[PDB]
């Protein structure tokens, strides 16, 4: 053109990938939204988010998962919200008392002196405490060496509700629709979202539970496969059914301490005693392990591939763990990982549960009456790379963050700053 002039457009569609704080939106349908589901209406928007739409044409941008925002904000939200949930109840400090116990080797029958409602009077009580929660004829509770416990009082339920993460006013959420998206590099098939599909904030080590699959075949994700330290995350093309149970018909008794301030404990086992176990269909498991080996054989050039037992160490790190209806399991996965490129697993449970990040406060999960079952869908595996040594893989874990970074991989947060300058034939 001959001579042009500045023009100012407001409402231009441009963005800058930035940082912010995102809300949480629940997806409840009843008074469960007000019954404390930990992440209930007391800390999140009630329900009913909008659908997800508006595919965009010809857009391209560089995603990344291993330096994402949403995982750190989710982790801080989980820690703070969980801690706030545990504060307004006991405080089991009276129980740091000399426990006299005498042995079924897993459960020791312990008796101790405790106060009745009158503090000047005392009475004897008996309860069964699991052996890992006890440290030596004299015995004391594990926590007294470290810190004070805090009972997860009733009306709080650990069930993982799906929660949607909705971006605040001004920002927007972008998504990758490429089915074989490997976590990095420019994803062309982009579509904005008002807020995320249901994310189940489950927690589990050495495996993934109830998570989201991938429509196309099995995906493998990592930062730098040339490095052996990084943890691989695998999404399965189809789930494999798993069942866990505690056939012992336990019983719960309440003992009162000081004011109207109770504390539950496991009573006597009615009937016969049996060991809690988990069941995995071996047909599907062998098929899925073979498929994952077939996929892993590609990235590592034409080597053999094998799976060996876990690294060991702390039982929490060395064992798959659950939260199933208020009880915490620690199951051995040795029989699962044995092969190359049904089943029953023995399990043990604890009552004194530290936060599995190791940073939260001690918790005492109360016992739950009646024999309990727990039915789940396994969907992803957490491996670490160890042909005689590069073939073997070891299940690994320990970090809460890696359990969610498998789910928030598609998502990104963008800041809108819509004011654009352009040249054209103008004059005021």
């Amino acid at each position: 053109a001959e001579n042009l002039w500045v023009t100012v457009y407001y409402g231009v569609p441009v963005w800058k990938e930035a940082k912010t704080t995102l809300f949480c939106a629940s997806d409840a349908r009843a008074y469960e939204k007000e019954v404390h589901n930990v992440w209930a209406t007391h800390a999140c928007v009630p329900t009913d988010p909008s659908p997800q739409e508006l595919f965009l044409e010809n857009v391209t941008e560089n995603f990344n998962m291993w330096k994402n925002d949403m995982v750190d904000q989710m982790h801080e939200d989980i820690i703070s919200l969980w801690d706030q949930s545990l504060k307004p109840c006991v405080k089991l400090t009276p129980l740091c008392v000399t426990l006299i116990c005498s042995n079924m080797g897993e459960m020791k029958n312990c008796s101790f002196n405790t106060t009745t409602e009158i503090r000047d009077k005392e009475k004897k009580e008996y309860a069964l405490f699991y052996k890992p929660d006890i440290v030596p004829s004299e015995y004391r509770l594990i926590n007294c060496n470290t810190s004070a416990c805090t009972q997860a009082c009733p009306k709080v339920t650990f069930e993982p509700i799906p929660i949607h993460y909705c971006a605040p006013a001004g920002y927007a959420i972008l998504k990758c629709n490429n089915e074989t998206f490997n976590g990095t590099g420019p994803c062309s098939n982009v579509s904005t979202v008002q807020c995320t599909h249901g994310i189940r904030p489950v927690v589990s080590t050495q495996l993934l539970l109830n998570g989201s699959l991938a429509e196309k075949e099995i995906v493998i994700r990592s930062e730098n496969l040339t490095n052996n330290a990084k943890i691989i995350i695998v999404h399965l093309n189809t789930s494999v059914e798993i069942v866990c149970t505690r056939p012992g018909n336990n019983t719960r008794k309440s003992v009162r301490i000081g004011p109207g301030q109770t504390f539950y404990a496991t009573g006597d086992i009615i009937g016969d005693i049996r060991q809690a176990h988990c069941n995995i269909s071996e047909k599907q498991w062998n098929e899925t392990l073979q498929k994952v080996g077939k996929e892993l054989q590609k990235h590592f050039p034409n080597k053999t591939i094998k799976y060996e037992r876990s690294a060991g160490g702390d039982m929490e790190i060395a064992t798959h763990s659950f939260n199933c209806g208020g009880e915490f399991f620690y199951c051995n996965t040795s029989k699962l990982f044995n092969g190359t490129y049904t089943i029953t697993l023995q399990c043990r449970i604890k009552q004194i549960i530290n936060m599995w990040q190791g940073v939260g406060r001690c918790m005492y999960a109360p016992p739950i009456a009646g024999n309990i079952t727990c039915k789940s869908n396994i969907t992803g595996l957490l491996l670490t790379r160890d042909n005689k040594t590069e073939e073997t893989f070891r299940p690994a874990g320990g970090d809460m963050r890696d359990n969610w970074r498998s789910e928030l991989y598609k998502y990104k947060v963008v800041k809108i700053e819509p004011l654009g300058v352009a040249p054209t034939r103008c004059k005021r």
């Binding site: 042009l4 500045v6 004011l419 654009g420």
Partner: protein, 125 residues
């Protein structure tokens, strides 16, 4: 729809331009942290928006959406031809290119509106 023309050309996304203006404020929205961390978000949404409207007020374009001005376009700000951008380039590509020189052209408009204000004011004063 919101961001419905994010990929189209400059002369194609220039239509509407009110989906991007009607969204920047609207939305669904004991002492608890969830209370404060929402109020921190909301006040930063409104304060970011007012800073945009106040910036259009000084340039005389408040109320307008497309607004001509009187600051010439030196060719050094863009070597690419000035009749090709309007039917080839996406708005984002324009942002990444000319975002280097933003504070120059902003500063000129900060005075090039006050300049004509004085002449209008001195037409009768």
């Amino acid at each position: 729809g919101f961001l419905g023309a994010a990929g189209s050309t400059m002369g194609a996304a220039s239509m509407t331009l009110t989906v991007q203006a009607r969204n920047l404020l609207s939305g669904i929205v004991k002492l608890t942290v969830w209370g404060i961390k929402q109020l921190q978000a909301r006040v930063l949404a409104v304060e970011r928006y007012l800073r945009d409207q106040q910036l259009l007020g000084i340039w005389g374009c408040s109320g307008k959406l497309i607004c001509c001005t009187n600051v010439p376009w030196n060719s050094s700000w863009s070597n690419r031809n000035l009749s090709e951008i309007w039917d080839n380039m996406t708005w984002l590509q324009w942002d990444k290119e000319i975002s280097n020189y933003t504070q120059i052209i902003y500063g000129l408009l900060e005075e090039s509106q006050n300049q004509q204000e004085k002449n209008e004011q001195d037409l009768l004063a």
